[PDB]
């Protein structure tokens, strides 16, 4: 009944994205420093 | 009965149906 912007998960997903918390594999970040060359 | 006077006062028991006069007065000063 309530509008999507007011109760929607995807709108929370915009304001708090999962990408704001990086998660790399050891294949790309073996040294745990964000892929620093 | 007070709540009944509320229903009569506001016209809650009224079905509107059908199917206000001139208010523009002109004045004459004549020539300039």
């Amino acid at each position: 009944f309530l509008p999507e912007a007011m109760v929607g998960r995807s709108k929370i997903d915009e304001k708090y994205p999962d990408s704001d918390y990086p998660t790399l594999t050891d294949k790309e970040d073996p040294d745990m420093n964000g892929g620093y060359i | 009965t007070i709540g009944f006077v509320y229903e009569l006062g506001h016209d809650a028991l009224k079905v509107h149906s059908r199917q206000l006069k001139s208010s523009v007065v002109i004045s004459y000063l004549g020539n300039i």
């Binding site: - | 006069k21 002109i26 000063l29």
Partner: protein, 238 residues
């Protein structure tokens, strides 16, 4: 009590009420018509007909002067000349102003005659009149708004609109003396086209007809000659 007609009182013809100001209205209507004919060439019989009929009926309406007209017209000049800004259509608009819940008036010119049209705020009962009759434009825009939306809201009206009770730089226009119900009959005996409310509506339709005649150019040569045999019927040779 019975001296004057009551505006909006039914006349005996349905939907036709008593005109708040029949004399000036006919002059306004007649002078306005005598102005629009001037875009017609003088050799048009339509011009000469309307020009003849309107002037004949104009001189009759002038012949019936309300009581005290000379006194009021001398006063009303000293108002228009002293406070022309208040009644100027180029300044207050063609509708007399924006505040409908107070009095309004503009000065209008026809043929060079000067007219002042006034809009007294509509007479309604106290108990069904909200904010003195102010216009409800709806709730002011609140919250986060863009400038354009605030512009479209009417934000420039804070600095131009008037509190109706604010009346110091303005003068209260008193309108023209009216015709005593005896004079209304006497005038309409001269015109001879029914009630004066009937005479008025025929005058205003006469005003609107001029624009259609002008556009069509009804005084120019015949468009379509009838072709041979067009208006032949079953007549026997004489």
């Amino acid at each position: 009590k019975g001296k004057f007609l009551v505006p909006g009182a039914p006349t005996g013809l349905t939907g036709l009420g008593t005109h708040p100001s029949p004399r000036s209205a006919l002059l306004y209507l007649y002078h306005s018509t005598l102005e629009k004919l001037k875009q017609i060439p003088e050799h048009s019989v339509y011009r000469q007909s309307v020009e003849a009929v309107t002037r004949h009926r104009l001189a009759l309406v002038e012949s019936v002067v309300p009581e005290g007209y000379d006194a009021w017209v001398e006063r009303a000049k000293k108002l228009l000349e002293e406070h022309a800004d208040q009644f100027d259509p180029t300044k207050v608009g063609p509708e007399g102003g924006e505040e409908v819940q107070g009095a309004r008036a503009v000065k209008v010119e026809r043929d060079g005659r000067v007219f002042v049209v006034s809009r007294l705020p509509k007479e309604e009962d106290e108990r069904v009149l909200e904010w003195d009759g102010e216009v409800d434009e709806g709730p002011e825009l609140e919250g986060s708004r863009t400038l354009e939306e605030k512009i479209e809201g009417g934000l420039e009206k804070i600095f131009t609109r008037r509190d109706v009770k604010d009346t110091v730089g303005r003068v209260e226009w008193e309108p023209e003396p009216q015709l005593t119900a005896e004079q209304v009959a006497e005038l309409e005996n001269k015109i001879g086209a029914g009630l004066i409310e009937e005479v008025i509506q025929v005058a205003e339709g006469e005003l609107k007809l001029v624009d259609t005649m002008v556009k069509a150019r009804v005084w120019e040569p015949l468009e379509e000659q009838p072709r041979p045999g067009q208006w032949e019927y079953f007549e026997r040779k004489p």
